[PDB]
């Protein structure tokens, strides 16, 4: 149950000293990553987010306007061109505010939700690096919500719902929640902090989430909620964050015209659910020990012959399943059927399809799961439909 | 017919002096971009490529092993961490060789086809920058094919087919092809250059492509084929490239076990079809003058009411088309119908659905195209079918 070993075994990714803390995603790991992308994007549609893409580097002058340069310059990668300094982005928030600043906005346009699978880079100390979980380059399931003060509590609600929707998809039901209150050095008045912390507290109350305070741990520009999921070994993983921000939009001249036709600065909410997706793939690898749910498995089906008397029946079925959008391969090698099955069982393929002449003539397939339960011979059309239903529903469990 | 003007009008992207030559994709531009990802990915499945992802930055020591540092150091962004120098990748090729170098390779594994949507960054002089077309940061529809010398012809064939397949989808039918022959300073023997030049020449000959030589214009490590498409204004756009490489894999220690059990160095084919995807979106924007085919339109359908007495029929219709995978939005605003319709015609929405009492009771919609043609009241399920078919087939033409 160690993702670095499973990662090498299943050929998912590798890393090397020429690029410390930066992942090389091989075909099969990248398939997991992209399947996560598709799932998140399905959520962005359902919860009505825009998806944008910002540039990898911006002028360091801009990073000073944010105030982040003064605090976290050392975690930043800088480069040069024509006598200007640029930083490679460690976060997506200012870029999103830059998208927001194009075109006059109106209260009509808020809440405005803006997501990005944003590639970030942080100059992490090399000795702290570890596999997929402490890296220098990661991708974040990142969104920012611009809204009015009246819309905060409804927008946080939506984020809270999103969190439990997505964690439960992976079997994570034990979640611990913490609210981080005002730190010693902060901006804003005590009254503004009073209602900011109240909005986060009330949102969790309307959702029936018990929670607990992390006193003084809040950012200098707002409180936050932090979500911690527990894996099947009862290790805690902080993944989710909803973070209120009353400083950045004003620092970057974001404004909208209000109901009263006066100019107003929007509230910004920062939220990620998986957090860093390389890290989340790491958790999943260990939570599942490599036996990924069908919808995540790099290879969902392998089809095998008994003799060469079925090689083309296999090939036609491989094609048939592929047209159904199933990641399927054929194993027509001249090896014993128990050799092939161990090969693909070691590779954690969810379903092994075997065709003898017994089943070639009837139009069926014999079906074996990776755990070793034999489901016998079923009609191909019924097998394909049952596979699709399992994939579309992102089922954690296989057939029976 | 200028993409930069159209780009601001349709709210596709923007750029700013804080990040010269780097694109901010807004929601509507990023929809186009992502839809091109899905189209390329459809082809990657059909032509059987792996899709991988390499790290964004790599040790400059590795970039010296490739020989690219001597020639192209001035084009590279470089950065420091703990007293090591790193280049942001201007290209994906060395990263893919790193992926190939994990695990011993046998001749059985070739041809190995490896694609990536690679984020590259080149320190282009700022005075040369222009729109989406000459930039500092861009994404490439990249792939590398590792094969044996006996396998080159069939692989180049496969690349030549893919080029004509994709360009055809967009309506580019006039394509000019040029073969760059050996340069004055080069690696390899004349005998090997003779077979390599003939390899590219034979592959085009088998696919009936006439072509022309670009004498002496080859890279020092191989000949190439370059494809130039002509747009509807009859301007020439060089997009596709097929580069044979007989130097890089040996310099980076690639090797396989041959069928004679002697270890050999593989051939690399470098291969891009659209080239820079930003640039391609720019060409498409000018090629269509913003009237994107339905499968690329950021918003495919707008539904509208006559009065308020249909606001809910519109809303259920909107959800009904959303579930069908159609990018549809509803316009329930209190405005005249000719005002709404002009609004969405200026935005180049392909289809405009309108609902009064007549269509609500009947379960139909009045359908209007952006050209201005009325298609009348057809059944809702028949117009969803026709939209799906037009989208799935990536048709350039609309209904009728
Ligand atoms: C303050 O805003 C805080 N942001 C977040 O924690 C955050 C969470 C989830 C999504 C988004 O978009 C967020 O911004 C601040 O960015 C924290 C921070 C700590 C360290 C570094 N660093 O460069 O090592 C950057 C930002
Ligand atoms: C030599 O290999 C040449 N590559 C290509 O032309 C190429 C075309 C399409 C796809 C791929 O993957 C390719 O590698 C070489 O890369 C030429 C070149 C490299 C770097 C720069 N630079 O501005 O740093 C310019 C040209
Ligand atoms: Zn943020
Ligand atoms: Zn290349």
Residue numbers in the entry:
A (entry chain A), B (entry chain B): 242 to 641
The article reads:
Aminoacyl-tRNA synthetases (AARSs), a family of essential protein synthesis enzymes, are attractive targets for drug development. Here we present five unusual crystal structures showing that threonyl-tRNA synthetase (ThrRS) is covalently inhibited by a natural product, obafluorin (OB). OB contains a β-lactone ring with a 2,3-dihydroxybenzamidyl moiety attached to the α position and a 4-nitrobenzyl moiety attached to the β position. When ThrRS catalyzes tRNA aminoacylation, the Zn2+ ion recognizes and binds l-threonine, assisting in the l-threonine activation reaction.
To elucidate the mechanism by which OB inhibits ThrRS, we cocrystallized a fragment of Escherichia coli ThrRS containing catalytic and anticodon-binding domains (residues 242–642) with OB and determined the structure to a resolution of 2.5 Å. In the two catalytic domains of ThrRS homodimer, OB was bound to the active site for Thr-AMP formation. In total, 18 residues in the active center of ThrRS were located within 4.5 Å of OB and thus interacted with it. Interestingly, the four-membered ring of the β-lactone of OB was opened in the ThrRS-OB structure. Instead, the acyl group formed a new ester bond with the phenolic group of Tyr462. In addition, the two hydroxyl groups on the o-diphenol moiety of OB formed two coordination bonds with the conserved catalytic Zn2+ ion of ThrRS. This structure suggests that OB inhibits ThrRS by forming coordination bonds with the Zn2+ ion in the catalytic center of ThrRS, allowing its β-lactone ring to be approached and attacked by the phenolic group of Tyr462, and finally forming a new covalent bond with Tyr462. The ThrRS-OB structure showed that the o-diphenol group of OB occupied the position of l-threonine and replaced it to bind Zn2+ ion and Asp383. At the same time, the conformations of Gln484 and Met332 were changed to accommodate OB. Therefore, the nitrobenzene group of OB occupied the binding site of tRNA A76, which prevented tRNA from entering the active center of ThrRS.
